Amino acid sequence: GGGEQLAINELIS
Amino acid sequence: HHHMLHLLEQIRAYCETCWEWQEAHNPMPAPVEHQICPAVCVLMKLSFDEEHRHAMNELGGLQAIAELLQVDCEMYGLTNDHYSITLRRYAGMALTNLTFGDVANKATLCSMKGCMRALVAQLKSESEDLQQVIASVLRNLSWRADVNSKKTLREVGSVKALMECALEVKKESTLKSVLSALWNLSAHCTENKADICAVDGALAFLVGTLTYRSQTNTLAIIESGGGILRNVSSLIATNEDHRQILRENNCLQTLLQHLKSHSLTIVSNACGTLWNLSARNPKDQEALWDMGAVSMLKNLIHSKHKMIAMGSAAALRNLMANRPAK
Numbered sequence: 001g002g003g004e005q006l007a008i009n010e011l012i013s
Numbered sequence: 014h015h016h017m018l019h020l021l022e023q024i025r026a027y028c029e030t031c032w033e034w035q036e037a038h039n040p041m042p043a044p045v046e047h048q049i050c051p052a053v054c055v056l057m058k059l060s061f062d063e064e065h066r067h068a069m070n071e072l073g074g075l076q077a078i079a080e081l082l083q084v085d086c087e088m089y090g091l092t093n094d095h096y097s098i099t100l101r102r103y104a105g106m107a108l109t110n111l112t113f114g115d116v117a118n119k120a121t122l123c124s125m126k127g128c129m130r131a132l133v134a135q136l137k138s139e140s141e142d143l144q145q146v147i148a149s150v151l152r153n154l155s156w157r158a159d160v161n162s163k164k165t166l167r168e169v170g171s172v173k174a175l176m177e178c179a180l181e182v183k184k185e186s187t188l189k190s191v192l193s194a195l196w197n198l199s200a201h202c203t204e205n206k207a208d209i210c211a212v213d214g215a216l217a218f219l220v221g222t223l224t225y226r227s228q229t230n231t232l233a234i235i236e237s238g239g240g241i242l243r244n245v246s247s248l249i250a251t252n253e254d255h256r257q258i259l260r261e262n263n264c265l266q267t268l269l270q271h272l273k274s275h276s277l278t279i280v281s282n283a284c285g286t287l288w289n290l291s292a293r294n295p296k297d298q299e300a301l302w303d304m305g306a307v308s309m310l311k312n313l314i315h316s317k318h319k320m321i322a323m324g325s326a327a328a329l330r331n332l333m334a335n336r337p338a339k
Contacts, residue, residue, distance in 0.1 A: 001156065001196055001197050001200055001240070002152055002155075002156070002192070002193030002194060002195070002196035002197045002237060002240065003152075003156060003193070003197075004112075004113055004114065004152065004153045004156040004157075005109075005113065005149065005152065005153070005193075006061060006109065006110050006113050007057070007060075007061070007105075007106035007107070007109040007110050007146070007149060008061075009145070009149070009186065009189070009190065010102070010106050010109070010142075010145055010146050010149060010190075
């Protein structure tokens, strides 16, 4: 499955 | 703690002002005028730390933040103004963090139908950054969803909305988040698999992800796209129209090539898809024989990886029975 994650990928670069 | 209570009281106060306006409809409340975006911004930041989340939960952070997101969406709709997009992004990011590993919060947020509808509606925003945030929330909510959450996620049309969103995304990062959510949802029930299959051009898109060329040099899209395909292939197996779409995009050929991958997830996904598609279809059974699938799956039966050994053995056994003439 895709699992779960914190919003770490949505942090602005 | 003290600052956290202050920020949540600010957000609750704003929500209450907005509900007062909604019922009375006295000028329309604007988030800029109440400095709401800086408030959710800080709460978004703090929600990355486990101990701050603990305090945030005791102060009803999930309710305040979800309710803020909901009310802004109901008030302004799909707007493009920077302030509202940013507000919704931060709020959704905080909701992502507050639902991470939290059984109660996942189920609670799903039971909030008004907020769930608002979230799903945001997938058609022309802000992909916003789309990415919404998909991340839905990813967490669909991970180990209880019976009630599974029903809610289905009823608010989250599966169809995410699949339609995926066809339109221009950015890899948005697509990662979208496909991860769909990967979770595609395992929920048959209805969710059917909804993916019923979206126009979705199956062809999914086969397309199997040969995706990441420029961030990741395998994320191949893994998740192949994961979704593996889940829905049990429905494809009994549908000749769906099998044909897969045939036209050289799906079986790619799945065999996937058995050579160094990523165990890709091999596992390929083994599961071939397991489903090797059943009850002489045409595809023959094609798998002609491509040398028997010997290729023979290498993977003694694998130390559980799903690879099981999937490859299940597929091989379907091929060993139903032998085409030499």
